[PDB]
């Protein structure tokens, strides 16, 4: 019997700042015990300061991507170039997704960019298109593994301030670009030593108001 | 299993349905409703799978009222069943059937009799004395068979019922949450609010 | 749905400073049966692109008649259809993974695995994948079936980076290539003897190699292996 | 897998080919299909490698034990012993075996058991998956007392068509010539026998 | 999981990758796959974990044993036989895929067992997941009259192509080195590709950064005197 | 149905200076219901410590096994049993049931108390061996608490700090499987003092 | 998932957990299991997310458009069987949906609608709805009356999702509560179970089962 | 769903089980106890499937009457839940498990303490202050964890108990025909008949 | 069912066993499996009876149509549209057909149409249930630019083993000669080609 649905691997992650946004995911593609590539872009520059990736079956990510990126270019026509705003991109991609409800997407799609008040946004969905705001999320194969990392050192859970033992907590200080790529690389290094779908490569997007930057680091090949 | 129960006595139409909505683990009310008025003479009572069977009988509720506008005149019971028994015939070879069982309970004004039809979900009619859906009429239709007569009066006809609930209280798994009753005779629908 | 019926095996490739180089066996086989011996995988569209199939044959021939057809369409009102507007092998690649998506889309999938070849207007290497699932990716080597296990890895010790590409030559390409088809034919057991093998250079442009033949074959040590354990004699 | 053995003026030959396959991953391509029982008493094997291993391993110790108590055994003796297991043990087994031998009184012999576990003596059997394509060519090329040349050649031919229509089927040619003379052990590379 | 066997002229070379996985997790980055069944013949395995232990240990005991009862060196045939036999008895059950390699008097071997009870001999063999990355390297570059020194290359190299190319297989590779005429030499560790790189950041924690309900002193002790 | 993620629970171990850790959440369920917040899943045998996570019958079961054998063990040798021959113990004893396994992930910690050397090992449910340097772990959270002691963890540290890395492992990774977490315990092990401590997390 | 809602004397209490699952995974502990449809209008969240999020912010759409050529506000009694009605056509397809629709008009007055996945639609005064509502339901039926105070009600329903939190593997996170009276609904905060338990444990004096 | 309860308090523990018997369609009695006392302080409830449930209750029974007589001592409730559980786990992995779910509630005179636990039909023994075999738990456990104490009496037990069955009577489907009392204290078991 | 159509210096010969069965029962022994498409392209027919005569009729009536409009059709274009038959209607069909035609311009001609829908142009082509047992056979005897008398006996001996040995093959053995000099009708009964 014919199988519709594939397992391309891979993991995603988006970490939102007080003034920037990341989206970061591998550049390995997969299926079962073989590597595809090592280099195959995931994350994608949407246009309107807007990323975007979605990461499970990869042709069904390119579609939606493409899908999402069509629905950009439609916007500008039909509403006189007006900017899309992150929470008005979620709400369309949630209609893409809800589209095929009944034969989904087979992906975790995360957004990421600038809100109206010039603070920095993620959005997560999942594959039939059910989507929420966020701090942080990672998604894909080695999520299970990078998700408590991230609520450990982003939003400092269990973690309170010495000497009042457990009575005071430790208080939530934004975090700095340069700190954030930190705990992206850390996360990325430690989930390419224990998972086998994830390597390779990193592919970090970061937005701010200037525009979208990019920055690439080499993963263990193995 | 949804109890719904139906006497005709020498006056009137007596049916009784459980009060109790159980989904899965939980009963999520107490006082549910199993009836809708299809015209002043004549009511239906319901059970079977959970949605259908409140939008079947509003459905039907709906085109009989429509009737009634359109010709200033009530249909007698056994044209308003015969309607629904097509309505449940039609149903059974469609995409996704209606899987309701009714009783329809009515007055006919013109012959002056109470009238009792059951109609299961396949579209099968049969007028009855006493009538019965689903596990009730492994209890009840025995019992019946042995406490009936054509000429009983209401009063007779409530205690008769009474009887059958007491029956299916005791033997009976589920708990159904007790009865509402409701009489059909020459006056219209009335409820009985303490049973 | 269905099932494959006639199908080619292995099409591997990869790239090179100047250029590509595709390669693919010449049989088409009916399950266990070797069936047909003289069947062409690659083809060529224009003097840029060469497309490797491998799965069931009878959509290979559909594919074969759709780039055909594309030629044939592209030419329509086109001055420039043999200059600035002639096909590209991006243009022929996403056409083809557009149908492969769709027709998966459908329950309905054309039951291949086809890798695009070829170099571009402004000299670029062009290679990209595509199957059945309408999934595509590129790499420096790509291979599909049991190339995918066994050639890849051969590819890569040349070409294990985009760096490299440079670096490597069009005859340490071919000898790479030519090896990996012999190494195939040892250990693929719906494998041919007899492949064709396809280059498309920024300068000097396609050429189509036919009739070739895996050579230089180990088989000598066999006569030395006795038994499966314990036997001597 | 392709195997034959054909008796002949001087006695029997066993063939194979030396594929082992895994679907369609080759596990080894030099395998040794051609297996002994006793000095003049060998098997071809077809099917699973273990199930066939595990026999053949059993009926050279029956043999070897035959031997030390009532001399050397009979190729039908053999195929016997071959039969007894394959038939008893149906259910769980996968091997169809040909048995091909050499005495002095009965000269050159060959038995063949397939699936069922059934016994056929035959003039010359095939066997494997690869036999279904050279039922046509071997019926109208055997011949009853061939020479020992002709005989080889008839296998290599057989052999050759075999390997090019079976997927199942390839390597290199074994083959095992048993004679008054001796054991002689033959071998053809895919260079020799695929321009045939 | 990939592991390798090459023959050369005195002897013979097995190794192994040492990644140990649990689905697409891994459990181990730096397994030992490469087994001893006695001090000359070693075995490499793949498959079920727990199965090749066990089979080898089994073995390995019976081998020791045997070795004692005939005054002997055990030979690489008799562990063969009685790995071979067990595996078969129970149906491919016990998931157990080895290459055994050894010397003995009769000289050097190499075998492959399945786990239905299949063995094969050859002069270069490869199983697991990167059996195919490494046979193609194998296929590629093995030649007769290799040396020790060759012969460990293109071992090492077999796994290597297991290890960038397999996602079941990683980490590390071990060799073992089986001469005629001399102790075997086990190299754990013999190549060491895939160290991880410095983290740009320490996790150490402030102490007392994890809240606490209550301590208390374990007696791990036994019963005092007095 | 699947019998290792019925109950719930999860078990982690972790080498440092001197000194070796493991901890255990508290929760035991019938799948979405939780039962027990005292369900222990470390036991110690000796100077040996024995954290198991699966079926909760088969963890009670082991425990009573291993503390019969032992106890046996230290009769006849007249000494208590090292983790190094303790783990292989384990091994023997789950593979004799290969066929009719217990559906456990038992993980052995401890120190030797000859050569004072910190071990820590791990298992699957029918008895192969995972002798790691750094960490093991164990239970239906086990890919959360691999991702947190992987970036966590840092070779040599003191007992003090080690409970910090183990204790933030657990917890966070607890948090993110439904079917761990209600209470947990930290074992902080030197040659000769052990230190258990009842860690405070949340409650759902 | 634990969602409940019910009538009282000073309107209607509507309280929620926060977790989000897939299998044993925790996906999310900070998800809005309530939709503020309009300034009278809430709806409750409970089996699949994109299904009840999706069709109840769609539900939002149609209420609207009901005030713009009705010119007068959506019942609660229309604005759910437009619902139910809607999951009706999809009955069968796989829809997974658990709601209650909460709100205020003049001639209803405080009304809770139960809407299913299954086309159940029910009127009445007390509902918990999702795979901890057994929970919920325990301490809710115990120490329900009708004659609770706004906070006396807003703690009891606090407190239900509370202890269906502790028990229900697949609730927890927090506890979103709302108070719904004749001048619309009133949000009373986001309260986490990590801080809440502690809290509710110490100043009660329940919860024994844990040790603290 | 056999519903059956157990609650340890300050000086007792208090098992409490249904007493219906539904084989099918019937509830075929509407007094049954399930529960047999093992020792003079130790009682054992028991739910799960038909005719299992008593042949594995009286087994234990006799093994602990056993064990009574030949040592002239009663066995501590503790190591009368340690053998219940190590026969459960034997039988987890028989030809046929016994299919059966147990509360062993126990007054331990040497410690003056009562004691409850809960033991599946795998094996999986937990003490607890309160607890509850099937979909009773579902309702009553969050229920006691907001109404418990270490501190009350056995008449706040008692209380807290009903406060569980009114729960169980108003949101379970089924009707279970009420349930038997018994308290386990230091002065041994009895019934508590008005309930 | 054996199947086979061979061309040779002045044009095709078609070949075919006349045997129809239902499990092992023969329905029909003296079937006729050479059918005509048009005045010299004919066709072989294997698989389905049902499926092999419905497409054979509507590729007659394609031919016939193309006939009035465009004059006679080439060999090619015949193999095209029992192509577009089979391949666009794989899901529904079990046919596996052998199309063989008469040019001047292009001579004999030979196309194969197996199960998936694909063409295969060739010397000479086999199918059928029987053709599994004289690949070996026909790969070894074949020759290009044979005679009329050599490819009547190649034909007529390749069948003859393919009924041989396959149960699903028997009866008489019917030939459809296409030349320029027209269209011959052969048949050869079982006393003649069995003794071969
Ligand atoms: C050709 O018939 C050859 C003859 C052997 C005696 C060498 N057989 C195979 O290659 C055989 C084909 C399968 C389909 C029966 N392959 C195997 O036997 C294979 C060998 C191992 C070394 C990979 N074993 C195998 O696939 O194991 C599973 C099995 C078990 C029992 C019966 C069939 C298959
Ligand atoms: C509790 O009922 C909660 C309410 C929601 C409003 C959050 N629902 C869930 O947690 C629910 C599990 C239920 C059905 C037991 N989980 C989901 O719906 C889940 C949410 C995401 C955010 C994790 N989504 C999900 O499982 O995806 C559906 C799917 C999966 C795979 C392929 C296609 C679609
Ligand atoms: C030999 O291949 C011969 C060729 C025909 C064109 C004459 N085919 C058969 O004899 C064929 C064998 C079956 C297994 C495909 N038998 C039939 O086709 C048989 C003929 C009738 C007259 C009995 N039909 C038959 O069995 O119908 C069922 C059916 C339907 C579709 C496909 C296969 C079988
Ligand atoms: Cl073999
Ligand atoms: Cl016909
Ligand atoms: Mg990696
Ligand atoms: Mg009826
Ligand atoms: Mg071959
Ligand atoms: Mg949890
Ligand atoms: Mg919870
Ligand atoms: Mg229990
Ligand atoms: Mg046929």
């Given at each position: 019997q014919f199988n519709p649905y594939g397992d391309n691997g891979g993991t995603i992650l988006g970490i939102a700042g007080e003034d920037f946004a990341v989206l970061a995911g591998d550049t390995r593609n997969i299926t079962d015990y073989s590597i595809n590539s090592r280099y195959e872009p995931k994350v994608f520059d949407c246009g309107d300061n807007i990323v975007m990736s979605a990461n499970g079956f990869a042709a069904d990510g390119d579609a939606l991507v493409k899908r999402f990126?069509?629905?950009?270019?439609?916007?500008?026509?039909?509403?006189?170039?007006?900017?899309?705003?992150?929470?008005?991109?979620?709400?369309?991609?949630?209609?893409?997704?809800?589209?095929?409800?009944?034969?989904?997407?087979?992906?975790?799609?995360?957004?990421?960019?600038?809100?109206?008040?010039?603070?920095?946004?993620?959005?997560?969905?999942?594959?039939?298109?059910?989507?929420?705001?966020?701090?942080?999320?990672?998604?894909?194969?080695?999520?299970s593994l990078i998700m408590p990392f991230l609520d450990n050192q982003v939003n400092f859970k269990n973690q309170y301030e010495p000497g009042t033992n457990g009575k005071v907590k430790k208080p939530l200080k934004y975090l700095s670009v340069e700190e954030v790529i930190k705990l992206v690389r850390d996360s990325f290094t430690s989930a390419t030593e224990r998972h086998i779908q994830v390597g390779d490569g990193l592919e970090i997007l970061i937005v701010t108001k200037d525009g979208v930057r990019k920055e690439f680091y080499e993963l263990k090949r193995d | 299993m949804d109890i719904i129960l139906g006497i005709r006595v020498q006056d009137s139409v007596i049916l009784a349905s459980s009060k109790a909505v159980t989904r899965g683990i939980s009963v999520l009310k107490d006082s549910d409703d199993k009836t809708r008025q299809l015209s002043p003479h004549t009511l239906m009572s319901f059970a079977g799978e959970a949605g259908d069977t409140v939008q079947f009988a509003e459905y039907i509720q709906a085109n009989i009222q429509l009737y009634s506008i359109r010709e200033d005149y009530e249909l007698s019971p056994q044209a308003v069943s015969s309607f629904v028994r097509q309505e449940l015939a039609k149903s059974i070879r469609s995409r996704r059937p209606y899987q309701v069982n009714v009783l329809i309970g009515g007055y006919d004004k013109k012959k002056n009799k109470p009238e009792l039809y059951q109609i299961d979900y396949l579209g099968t009619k049969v007028e009855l004395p006493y009538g019965a859906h689903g596990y009730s009429g492994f209890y009840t239709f025995s019992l019946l068979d042995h406490h009936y007569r054509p000429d009983m009066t209401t009063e007779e006809g409530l205690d008769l019922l009474k009887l059958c609930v007491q029956e299916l209280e005791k033997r009976m798994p589920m708990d159904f949450k007790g009865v509402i009753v409701k009489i059909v005779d020459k006056d219209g629908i009335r409820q009985v609010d303490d049973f | 749905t269905q099932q494959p019926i006639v199908t080619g095996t292995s099409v591997i490739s990869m790239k090179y400073?100047?250029?590509?180089?595709?390669?693919?066996?010449?049989?088409?086989?009916?399950?266990?049966?070797?069936?047909?011996?003289?069947?062409?995988?690659?083809?060529?569209?224009?003097?840029?692109?060469?497309?490797?199939?491998?799965?069931?044959?009878?959509?290979?021939?559909?594919?074969?008649?759709?780039?055909?057809?594309?030629?044939?369409?592209?030419?329509?009102?086109?001055?420039?259809?043999?200059?600035?507007?002639?096909?590209?092998?991006?243009?022929?690649?996403?056409?083809?993974?557009?149908?492969?998506?769709?027709?998966?889309?459908?329950?309905?999938?054309?039951?291949?695995?086809?890798?695009?070849?070829?170099?571009?207007?402004?000299?670029?290497?062009?290679?990209?994948?595509?199957?059945?699932?309408?999934?595509?990716?590129?790499?420096?080597?790509?291979?599909?079936?049991?190339?995918?296990?066994?050639?890849?890895?051969?590819?890569?010790?040349?070409?294990?980076?985009?760096?490299?590409?440079?670096?490597?030559?069009?005859?340490?390409?071919?000898?790479?290539?030519?090896?990996?088809?012999?190494?195939?034919?040892?250990?693929?057991?719906?494998?041919?003897?007899?492949?064709?093998?396809?280059?498309?250079?920024?300068?000097?442009?396609?050429?189509?190699?036919?009739?070739?033949?895996?050579?230089?074959?180990?088989?000598?040590?066999?006569?030395?292996?006795?038994?499966?354990?314990?036997?001597?004699? | 897998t392709s195997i034959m053995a054909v008796t002949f003026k001087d006695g029997v030959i066993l063939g194979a080919d030396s594929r082992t396959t895994t679907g369609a991953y080759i596990a080894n391509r030099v395998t040794d299909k051609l297996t002994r029982v006793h000095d003049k008493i060998w098997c071809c094997?077809?099917?699973?490698?273990?199930?066939?291993?595990?026999?053949?391993?059993?009926?050279?110790?029956?043999?070897?034990?035959?031997?030390?108590?009532?001399?050397?055994?009979?190729?039908?003796?053999?195929?016997?012993?071959?039969?007894?297991?394959?038939?008893?043990?149906?259910?769980?087994?996968?091997?169809?075996?040909?048995?091909?031998?050499?005495?002095?009184?009965?000269?050159?012999?060959?038995?063949?058991?397939?699936?069922?576990?059934?016994?056929?003596?035959?003039?010359?059997?095939?066997?494997?998956?690869?036999?279904?394509?050279?039922?046509?060519?071997?019926?109208?090329?055997?011949?009853?007392?061939?020479?020992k040349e002709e005989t080889v050649?008839?296998?290599?031919?057989?052999?050759?068509?075999?390997?090019?229509?079976?997927?199942?089927?390839?390597?290199?040619?074994?083959?095992?010539?048993?004679?008054?003379?001796?054991?002689?052990?033959?071998?053809?590379?895919?260079?020799?026998?695929?321009?045939? | 999981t990939t592991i390798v066997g090459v023959k050369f002229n005195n002897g013979v070379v097995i190794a192994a990758d040492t990644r140990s996985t649990q689905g697409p997790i891994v459990a181990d980055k730096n397994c030992a796959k490469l087994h001893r069944i006695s001090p000359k013949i070693w075995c490499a395995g793949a498959g079920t974990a727990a199965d090749t232990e066990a089979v080898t240990q089994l073995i390995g005991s019976n081998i020791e044993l045997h070795s004692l009862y005939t005054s002997r060196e055990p030979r690489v045939v008799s562990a063969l036989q009685m790995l071979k036999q067990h595996l078969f008895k129970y149906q491919g059950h016990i998931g157990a895929y080895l290459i055994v390699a050894g010397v003995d008097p009769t000289g050097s071997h190499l075998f492959s067992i399945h786990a239905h009870g299949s063995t094969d001999?050859?002069?270069?063999?490869?199983?697991?997941?990167?059996?195919?990355?490494?046979?193609?390297?194998?296929?590629?570059?093995?030649?007769?009259?290799?040396?020790?020194?060759?012969?460990?290359?293109?071992?090492?190299?077999?796994?290597?192509?297991?290890?960038?190319?397999?996602?079941?297989?990683?980490?590390?590779?071990?060799?073992?080195?089986?001469?005629?005429?001399?102790?075997?030499?086990?190299?754990?560790?013999?190549?060491?590709?895939?160290?991880?790189?410095?983290?740009?950041?320490?996790?150490?924690?402030?102490?007392?950064?994890?809240?606490?309900?209550?301590?208390?002193?374990?007696?791990?002790?036994?019963?005092?005197?007095? | 149905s699947d019998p290792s993620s019925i109950n719930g629970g999860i078990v982690v171990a972790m080498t440092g200076k001197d000194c070796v850790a493991i901890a255990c959440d508290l929760r035991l369920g019938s799948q979405s219901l939780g039962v027990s917040n005292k369900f222990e899943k470390i036991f110690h045998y000796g100077h040996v410590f024995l954290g198991i996570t699966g079926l909760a019958t088969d963890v009670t079961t082991l425990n009573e096994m291993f503390r019969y054998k032992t106890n046996l063990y230290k009769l006849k040798e007249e000494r208590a049993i090292e983790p190094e021959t303790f783990t292989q113990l384990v091994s023997s004893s789950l593979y004799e049931r290969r066929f009719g396994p217990y559906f456990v992930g038992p993980v052995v910690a401890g120190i030797n108390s000859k050569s004072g050397k910190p071990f820590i090992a791990g298992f699957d449910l029918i008895g192969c061996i995972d002798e790691a340097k750094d960490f093991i772990v164990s239970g239906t959270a086990s890919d959360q608490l691999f991702g947190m002691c992987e970036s966590l963890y840092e070779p040599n540290l003191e007992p003090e700090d080690l409970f910090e890395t183990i204790s933030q492992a657990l917890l966070n990774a607890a948090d993110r499987d439904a079917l761990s977490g209600w209470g947990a315990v930290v074992y902080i092990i030197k040659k000769d003092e052990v230190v258990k401590r009842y860690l405070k997390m949340r409650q759902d | 998932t634990t969602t409940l809602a019910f009538r009282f004397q000073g309107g209607i209490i509507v309280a929620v957990d926060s977790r989000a699952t897939a299998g044993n995974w925790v996906a999310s502990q900070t998800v809005k299991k309530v939709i503020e449809i309009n300034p009278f209008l809430l709806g409750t969240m409970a089996g699949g997310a994109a299904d009840c999020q999706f069709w109840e912010t769609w539900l939002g759409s149609q209420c609207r458009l009901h005030e713009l050529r009705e010119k007068e506000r959506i019942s609660?009694?229309?604005?759910?069987?437009?619902?139910?009605?809607?999951?009706?056509?999809?009955?069968?397809?796989?829809?997974?949906?658990?709601?209650?629709?909460?709100?205020?008009?003049?001639?209803?007055?405080?009304?809770?609608?139960?809407?299913?996945?299954?086309?159940?639609?029910?009127?009445?005064?007390?509902?918990?709805?999702?795979?901890?509502?057994?929970?919920?339901?325990?301490?809710?039926?115990?120490?329900?009356?009708?004659?609770?105070?706004?906070?006396?009600?807003?703690?009891?329903?606090?407190?239900?999702?509370?202890?269906?939190?502790?028990?229900?593997?697949?609730?927890?996170?927090?506890?979103?509560?709302?108070?719904?009276?004749?001048?619309?609904?009133?949000?009373?905060?986001?309260?986490?179970?990590?801080?809440?338990?502690?809290?509710?444990?110490?100043?009660?004096?329940?919860?024994?089962?844990?040790?603290?």
């Open positions: 990126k069509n629905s950009v270019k439609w916007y500008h026509f039909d509403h006189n170039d007006k900017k899309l705003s992150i929470n008005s991109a979620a709400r369309n991609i949630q209609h893409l997704l809800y589209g095929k409800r009944f034969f989904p997407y087979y992906v975790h799609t995360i957004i990421a960019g600038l809100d109206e008040d010039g603070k920095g946004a993620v959005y997560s969905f999942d594959p039939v298109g059910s989507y929420e705001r966020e701090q942080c999320r990672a998604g894909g194969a080695a999520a | - | 400073d100047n250029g590509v180089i595709i390669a693919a066996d010449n049989l088409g086989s009916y399950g266990s049966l070797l069936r047909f011996n003289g069947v062409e995988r690659l083809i060529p569209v224009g003097d840029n692109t060469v497309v490797g199939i491998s799965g069931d044959i009878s959509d290979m021939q559909h594919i074969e008649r759709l780039l055909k057809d594309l030629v044939t369409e592209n030419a329509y009102d086109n001055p420039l259809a043999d200059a600035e507007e002639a096909l590209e092998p991006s243009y022929i690649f996403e056409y083809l993974a557009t149908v492969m998506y769709q027709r998966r889309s459908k329950m309905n999938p054309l039951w291949n695995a086809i890798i695009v070849a070829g170099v571009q207007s402004n000299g670029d290497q062009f290679l990209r994948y595509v199957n059945l699932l309408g999934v595509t990716y590129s790499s420096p080597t790509l291979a599909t079936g049991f190339g995918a296990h066994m050639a890849n890895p051969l590819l890569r010790k040349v070409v294990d980076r985009e760096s490299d590409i440079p670096k490597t030559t069009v005859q340490v390409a071919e000898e790479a290539i030519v090896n990996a088809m012999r190494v195939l034919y040892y250990r693929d057991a719906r494998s041919s003897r007899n492949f064709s093998l396809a280059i498309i250079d920024k300068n000097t442009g396609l050429t189509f190699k036919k009739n070739l033949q895996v050579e230089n074959m180990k088989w000598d040590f066999a006569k030395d292996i006795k038994g499966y354990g314990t036997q001597k004699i | 094997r077809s099917g699973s490698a273990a199930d066939t291993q595990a026999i053949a391993d059993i009926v050279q110790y029956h043999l070897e034990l035959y031997t030390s108590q009532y001399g050397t055994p009979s190729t039908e003796t053999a195929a016997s012993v071959f039969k007894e297991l394959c038939y008893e043990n149906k259910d769980n087994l996968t091997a169809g075996i040909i048995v091909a031998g050499y005495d002095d009184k009965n000269k050159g012999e060959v038995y063949t058991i397939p699936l069922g576990g059934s016994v056929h003596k035959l003039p010359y059997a095939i066997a494997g998956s690869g036999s279904t394509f050279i039922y046509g060519y071997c019926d109208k090329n055997f011949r009853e007392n061939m020479s050649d008839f296998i290599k031919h057989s052999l050759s068509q075999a390997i090019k229509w079976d997927g199942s089927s390839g390597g290199v040619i074994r083959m095992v010539v048993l004679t008054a003379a001796g054991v002689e052990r033959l071998i053809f590379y895919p260079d020799e026998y695929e321009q045939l | 001999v050859g002069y270069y063999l490869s199983l697991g997941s990167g059996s195919l990355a490494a046979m193609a390297v194998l296929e590629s570059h093995w030649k007769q009259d290799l040396t020790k020194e060759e012969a460990i290359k293109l071992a090492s190299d077999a796994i290597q192509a297991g290890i960038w190319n397999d996602l079941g297989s990683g980490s590390n590779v071990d060799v073992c080195v089986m001469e005629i005429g001399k102790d075997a030499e086990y190299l754990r560790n013999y190549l060491t590709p895939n160290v991880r790189e410095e983290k740009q950041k320490s996790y150490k924690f402030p102490r007392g950064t994890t809240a606490v309900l209550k301590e208390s002193i374990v007696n791990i002790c036994d019963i005092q005197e007095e | - | 609660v009694a229309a604005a759910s069987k437009i619902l139910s009605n809607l999951v009706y056509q999809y009955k069968g397809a796989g829809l997974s949906m658990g709601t209650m629709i909460c709100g205020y008009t003049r001639k209803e007055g405080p009304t809770i609608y139960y809407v299913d996945s299954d086309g159940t639609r029910l009127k009445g005064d007390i509902f918990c709805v999702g795979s901890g509502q057994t929970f919920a339901y325990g301490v809710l039926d115990s120490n329900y009356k009708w004659d609770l105070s706004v906070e006396d009600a807003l703690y009891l329903g606090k407190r239900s999702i509370l202890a269906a939190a502790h028990r229900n593997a697949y609730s927890g996170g927090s506890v979103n509560l709302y108070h719904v009276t004749e001048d619309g609904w009133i949000y009373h905060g986001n309260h986490d179970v990590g801080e809440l338990f502690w809290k509710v444990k110490e100043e009660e004096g329940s919860f024994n089962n844990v040790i603290g």
